[PDB]
Design an enzyme around this catalytic site. Structure first.
Site, PDB file in Angstrom:
ATOM      1  N   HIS A  29       0.829  -1.238   0.000  1.00 18.94           N
ATOM      2  CA  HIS A  29       0.000   0.000   0.000  1.00 18.94           C
ATOM      3  C   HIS A  29       0.849   1.267   0.000  1.00 18.94           C
ATOM      4  O   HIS A  29       0.635   2.158   0.825  1.00 18.94           O
ATOM      5  CB  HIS A  29      -0.958  -0.035   1.172  1.00 18.94           C
ATOM      6  N   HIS A  46       2.015   1.370  -5.707  1.00 19.21           N
ATOM      7  CA  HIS A  46       0.600   0.980  -5.891  1.00 19.21           C
ATOM      8  C   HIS A  46      -0.177   2.189  -6.425  1.00 19.21           C
ATOM      9  O   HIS A  46      -0.907   2.057  -7.442  1.00 19.21           O
ATOM     10  CB  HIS A  46       0.051   0.393  -4.597  1.00 19.21           C
ATOM     11  N   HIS A  56      -5.676   7.450  -3.827  1.00 14.85           N
ATOM     12  CA  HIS A  56      -6.776   6.624  -3.266  1.00 14.85           C
ATOM     13  C   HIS A  56      -6.333   5.941  -1.979  1.00 14.85           C
ATOM     14  O   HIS A  56      -7.227   5.501  -1.221  1.00 14.85           O
ATOM     15  CB  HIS A  56      -7.340   5.641  -4.295  1.00 14.85           C
ATOM     16  N   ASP A  57      -5.044   5.744  -1.764  1.00 15.91           N
ATOM     17  CA  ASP A  57      -4.524   4.992  -0.580  1.00 15.91           C
ATOM     18  C   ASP A  57      -3.588   5.875   0.269  1.00 15.91           C
ATOM     19  O   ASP A  57      -2.783   5.326   1.017  1.00 15.91           O
ATOM     20  CB  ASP A  57      -3.855   3.678  -0.985  1.00 15.91           C
ATOM     21  N   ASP A  65      -7.817  -0.891  -8.781  1.00 19.28           N
ATOM     22  CA  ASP A  65      -7.200  -1.185  -7.477  1.00 19.28           C
ATOM     23  C   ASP A  65      -6.692  -2.618  -7.450  1.00 19.28           C
ATOM     24  O   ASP A  65      -5.656  -2.888  -6.776  1.00 19.28           O
ATOM     25  CB  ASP A  65      -8.203  -0.942  -6.368  1.00 19.28           C
ATOM     26  N   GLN A 123      -6.112 -17.626  -3.183  1.00 13.74           N
ATOM     27  CA  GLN A 123      -6.161 -16.892  -4.470  1.00 13.74           C
ATOM     28  C   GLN A 123      -7.373 -17.325  -5.311  1.00 13.74           C
ATOM     29  O   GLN A 123      -8.069 -16.416  -5.864  1.00 13.74           O
ATOM     30  CB  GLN A 123      -4.818 -17.012  -5.191  1.00 13.74           C
TER      31      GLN A 123
HETATM   32  C1  LIG Z   1      -4.749 -10.405  -4.904  1.00 12.90           C
HETATM   33  N1  LIG Z   1      -5.337  -9.254  -4.239  1.00 12.90           N
HETATM   34  N2  LIG Z   1      -5.382  -8.044  -4.742  1.00 12.90           N
HETATM   35  C2  LIG Z   1      -5.945  -7.236  -3.799  1.00 12.90           C
HETATM   36  C3  LIG Z   1      -6.355  -8.003  -2.669  1.00 12.90           C
HETATM   37  C4  LIG Z   1      -7.127  -7.524  -1.494  1.00 12.90           C
HETATM   38  O1  LIG Z   1      -8.003  -8.158  -0.943  1.00 12.90           O
HETATM   39  N3  LIG Z   1      -6.871  -6.360  -0.875  1.00 12.90           N
HETATM   40  C5  LIG Z   1      -5.811  -5.381  -1.080  1.00 12.90           C
HETATM   41  C6  LIG Z   1      -6.246  -4.860   0.339  1.00 12.90           C
HETATM   42  C7  LIG Z   1      -7.464  -5.868   0.402  1.00 12.90           C
HETATM   43  C8  LIG Z   1      -5.915  -9.312  -2.984  1.00 12.90           C
HETATM   44  C9  LIG Z   1      -6.080 -10.609  -2.325  1.00 12.90           C
HETATM   45  O2  LIG Z   1      -5.339 -11.597  -2.486  1.00 12.90           O
HETATM   46  N4  LIG Z   1      -7.198 -10.726  -1.598  1.00 12.90           N
HETATM   47  C10 LIG Z   1      -7.557 -11.956  -1.011  1.00 12.90           C
HETATM   48  C11 LIG Z   1      -6.787 -13.166  -0.746  1.00 12.90           C
HETATM   49  C12 LIG Z   1      -7.717 -14.050  -0.087  1.00 12.90           C
HETATM   50  N5  LIG Z   1      -8.933 -13.367   0.078  1.00 12.90           N
HETATM   51  C13 LIG Z   1     -10.158 -13.711   0.776  1.00 12.90           C
HETATM   52  C14 LIG Z   1     -11.362 -14.071  -0.197  1.00 12.90           C
HETATM   53  F1  LIG Z   1     -11.579 -13.144  -1.208  1.00 12.90           F
HETATM   54  F2  LIG Z   1     -11.008 -15.163  -0.974  1.00 12.90           F
HETATM   55  N6  LIG Z   1      -8.825 -12.141  -0.497  1.00 12.90           N
HETATM   56 MG   LIG Z   2      -7.378   1.230  -0.138  1.00 14.98          MG
HETATM   57 ZN   LIG Z   3      -5.428   0.525  -3.318  1.00 15.14          ZN
END
Ligand SMILES: Cn1ncc(C(=O)N2CCC2)c1C(=O)Nc1ccn(CC(F)F)n1
Ligand SMILES: [Mg+2]
Ligand SMILES: [Zn+2]
Length: 313
Positions: free
Chosen positions: A68, A72, A106-107, A217, A269
């Protein structure tokens, strides 16, 4: 007036593609952003003296966190630049101006922790803003930086054009709260399918800008597989730090955030591509057909994660 930013040939060409990586040279990112503003908006949108001072204060107010961070910010702005350029005629001048600035800001001042972790910690920002906590903070930081002497890149707008652009930026930055994404996309889904979607309807535009912001994002999942996979390490380094801090408050974190459950990442993922990323780029592709390369890249990466699980890397 007559001072273009230009990029080396490889960047000049690849920057126009959705999957462009801005590279490991920090000192080139401001120029890359100015370049995108000049081509998205014009060489007059902003006073270069003021844009440059605004960019460097924004950079200063991102922290040294694994994911972050300032890279990004510039990455998410680049994905918005590619959306805007592949949909030239659909967006107002104010919208082109506001949305790249929204993506860059945004962040702002992110510490690497979720809204949930702030709430469990009882961080003051959680008392000041009950929902979309960090996102209300990012828009606050944006307004402050705009209010520094010499930093008001918008001051040449009329009073009402000014009010419109700040309102585009506020809605755009709030929409990066993923808790709001699910509802927004469902609603866009229904409107697209029943055929009621109307881009002359401000509330409809608002929703579509929100989906664009979610799409930009999450754009790490739309890169070449090696960019996608190395970014996921930065993303998980924050998640696991948050898991550690949860354990410190005496709370077992969800497994996504527990560094003792690294094994479970390839499957986490799959959930994320299937529950979030694929739906986001599908609806985005239905509403703005020329954004299809983000859906295609996202699908390629889901398949690469499937391959990791099957032992095949
Ligand atoms: C790859 N990627 N890009 C952004 C984000 C994300 O959530 N952010 C960025 C801040 C919050 C992720 C990510 O891996 N998220 C995931 C991984 C498992 N989960 C739980 C459910 F969705 F499966 N969520
Ligand atoms: Mg954010
Ligand atoms: Zn962001």
């Amino acid at each position: 007036g007559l001072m273009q930013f230009t990029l080396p040939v490889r960047l000049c060409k690849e920057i126009e593609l959705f999957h462009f990586d801005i590279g490991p040279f920090e000192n080139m990112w401001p120029g890359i952003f100015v370049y995108m503003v000049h081509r998205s908006c014009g060489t007059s949108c902003f006073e270069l003296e003021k844009l440059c001072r605004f960019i460097m204060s924004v950079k200063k107010n991102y922290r040294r966190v694994p994911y972050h961070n300032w890279k990004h910010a510039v990455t998410v702005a680049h994905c918005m630049y590619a959306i805007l350029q592949n949909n030239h005629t659909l967006f107002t001048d104010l919208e082109r101006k506001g949305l790249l600035i929204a993506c860059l800001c945004h962040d702002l001042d992110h510490r690497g922790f979720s809204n949930s972790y702030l709430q469990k910690f009882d961080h003051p920002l959680a008392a000041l803003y009950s929902t979309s906590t960090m996102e209300q903070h990012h828009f606050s930081q944006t307004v402050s930086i705009l209010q520094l002497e010499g930093h008001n890149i918008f001051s040449t707008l009329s009073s009402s054009e000014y009010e419109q652009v700040l309102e585009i930026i506020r809605k755009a930055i709030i929409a990066t709260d993923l808790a709001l994404y699910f509802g927004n996309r469902k609603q866009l889904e229904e409107m697209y399918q029943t055929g009621s979607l109307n881009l002359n309807n401000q509330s409809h535009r608002d929703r579509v800008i929100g989906l664009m912001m979610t799409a930009c994002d999450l754009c790490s999942v739309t890169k070449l597989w090696p960019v996608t996979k190395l970014t996921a390490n930065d993303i998980y380094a924050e998640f696991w730090a948050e898991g550690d801090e949860m354990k410190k408050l005496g709370i077992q974190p969800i497994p996504m955030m527990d560094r003792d459950k690294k094994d479970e990442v390839p499957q986490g993922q799959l959930g994320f591509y299937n529950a979030v990323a694929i739906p986001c780029y599908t609806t985005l592709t239905q509403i703005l057909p020329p954004t299809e390369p983000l859906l295609k890249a996202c699908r390629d990466n889901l398949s690469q994660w499937e391959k990791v699980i099957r032992g095949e890397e």
